[model samples]
Target: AFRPRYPRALFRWLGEVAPARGDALDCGCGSGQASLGLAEFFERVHAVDPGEAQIRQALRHPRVTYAVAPAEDTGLPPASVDVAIAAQAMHWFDLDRFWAELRRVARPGAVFAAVTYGLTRVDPEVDAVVDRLYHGLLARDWPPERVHVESGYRTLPFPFPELEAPPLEIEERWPMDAFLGYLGTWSAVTAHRRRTGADPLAEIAPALRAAWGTPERPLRVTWPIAIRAGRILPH
Candidate 1:
């Protein structure tokens, strides 16, 4: 129900901030959304994911190469990439290993970006229900890595020299089903379902339905995008 794409504005900004254009790396490129975005600016884009299935699902592009590999060991030639990006997936990475890998593949003064959009907010009524579900129902089930995302990577250690990034948001008009579909993609919700053999969303659906008005009627859904961007320093 959701598009696997980054905001066009983000790509525009990256194009401006990046030093010399060359190849870009999309780490944990689950289905190549961000990889496609990288392709717009870079001569070459290497999109890697540990899962073979995710690599298979990635969209094909002339400038993009899909690889099945872990974030810690991308197997790319050292100092080849001009930019390295992790979109909506860096929080799940072992940061230490991933950082080492970044240093290995990225050119000196090359740009690095980590991007994520978190938690959709609709109207007050719908938001209350979602807040309860997010904090109370699935709170414990969420992986510890989620804390990094929840804080918008503000607390996450970034070793490189930092760059000031413009604010960005993912905004959409969606019906009830679309919003519910988005909720279903939450890792905590999935974990709750797997452990309890019951869908947490099902219990919340009726309340959401009442607050959401007609199922076909659309409402604004917004996710605030967080970005951590920097330039690689000399060793």
Candidate 2:
């Protein structure tokens, strides 16, 4: 689901930037979407996640190995990875521990990249509805770690030497139902629903229908990508 929803160009660009030799590590790889993305470039991809359920449903690829592990202790060989990526999941990591694990597993000159996409935007009216849902309904329910995501990770500490990356965006066209489906996957939204015993999107459906004009008409959806790329130095 998230695979097709992701900006195809973003993953393609990451692959282009990755090193050609050795394995790539997809840390906190939920459902292996980014693992498959890494597989496009690396000879082998190790996809690690702490959540057993997420690992269970992960997609399989010949070049990718899915493991039920945390980013702080992936159980991969020391100095084995040439490149590593954390797509949208870096915010949840315990940075100090995760960095220590990275230093242990990543070889010299290994490129480490963190990528996250922001809230989707459509037309003004639809955008307003989304803002209400995101900032209003799900506000208090959002996890503390989500602040890093909201900041595009700029505020998070980066000890490695930073590398510049071009601005990137993902665009999609989806009808009302599909757009809502994407929103349904939000952690904040899920938490809201679970705590309140009611669907958050349902409350916004009337306005969404009113603003959308036609339920079947596809509308352009866009998410701005935030990236931080750096090269690891040997200790």
Candidate 3:
């Protein structure tokens, strides 16, 4: 529910850069959000993840196919994919094996895009409370790999000739209640809840509520998206 709306322009550009609209791969696609988007522009979309439960919950579309599979060995026919994308998912993959797997699956001159987004940003007052909750209270709860997310995916580099991507961001107007609900979905929040047997949001609720000013009125929230794109050389 907290997932951001990916801009259509992003998908359109992804589609335009590919060698063909025949097929696109959403590697590490959890629940098929990116896969569904790709379906709009591609003749077919292949969405894969190792998580069985995630595939079970995947959103369905006629052009999109969901599979329980790993990035390093997707089992798709060689040189079949026109564009390969990993949205907020490349961080967890074995990049060495994944590059080899990409070589095995992608069409010549195919496009590969790595997409990631970082922490939410709002006004000063709200951000202060959020900073307290995220950095102060939930410090140790966050996993180490989240460092890459914090840097907006700059830590990971693609080993192919890259494209110059235009800057993009997730801009939304969410009411205070909805915003709080989004925070509730963070894995770090879950981690803190399990370890302390308490809801950490309780401490920041008052300040956040005061900063929100009006509970029902929506406020602007934005998250910057970082993308690293490359065009694959022929095998």
TM per prediction: 0.87, 0.86, 0.91
Ranking by TM-score: 3, 1, 2
TM-score top scorer: 3
Comparing 2 with 3 on TM-score, the higher-scoring candidate is: 3
Candidate 3 C-alpha lDDT tens digits along 1-235: 5657777768888988888899999999988878888888999999999989999999989899899999888999998999999885564688889998988887889988888887889899999999999899999898656555566557766788888888888788999888888899888999999999999877678899999898899988988788888887653
lDDT of 3 at 125: 90
Residue 30 Cα positional deviation in candidate 3, in Å, after optimal superposition = 1.5
Regions of model 2 farther than 4 Å from truth: 1-4, 191-198
Instruction: Quote model 2's TM-score.
Output: 0.86
Shift of residue 26 alpha carbon in model 3, Å: 0.4
Residue-wise C-alpha lDDT for candidate 2, range 1-235, written one tens digit per residue: 3323456566666666555456899988988877876776678999998889999999989999999988889999998988888885573689999888988888787878888878888989999999999999899778666666567778768888887878887788889999988888888888998899989999999999999999999888888888888877643
**For candidate 3, what's the RMSD?**
2.0
Per-residue C-alpha lDDT of model 1 across residues 1-235, encoded as one tens digit per residue:
5642467788768777777678888888988878788788888999889988989999999999999998889999999988888885573589999889988988878888888877778889999999989998888778666676667778779999999889888778899898888888777888998889889989899999998989899898887888988997453
lDDT of each: 0.83, 0.82, 0.85
Residue-pair clashes per prediction, in order, are 0, 0, 0
